[PDB]
């Protein structure tokens, strides 16, 4: 890998919205272009969001999403 902490640089970006986490519109979009594996076939739009971080919140910030970014990968 290049760096461990290369998962900060790509949500926090996606945090375009100003709320600390991001409602599904600003992850499915993180999800597509950057990380399209991930969102290429399986995982869709309510299979991503409500897959790793609906602890029943509509919502998925950094930390909630931290695993997410390894779960991105091995």
């Known amino acids: 890998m290049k760096s461990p902490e290369e ?11 100003g709320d600390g986490q991001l ?3 600003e992850l ?5 272009t950057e990380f399209p ?17 609906k602890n029943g919140d509509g919502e998925v910030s950094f ?3 931290q695993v997410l970014v390894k779960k991105i990968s091995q």
Not at 37 to 53: A, I, P, V, Y
């Open 7 to 17: 998962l900060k640089g790509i949500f926090e970006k996606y945090d375009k919205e």
């Open 23 to 25: 409602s599904k519109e």
């Open 28 to 32: 499915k979009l993180l999800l597509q």
């Open 37 to 53: 594996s991930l969102l290429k076939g399986m995982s869709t739009l309510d299979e991503l969001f409500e897959e790793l971080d």
């Open 63 to 65: 930390e909630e999403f």
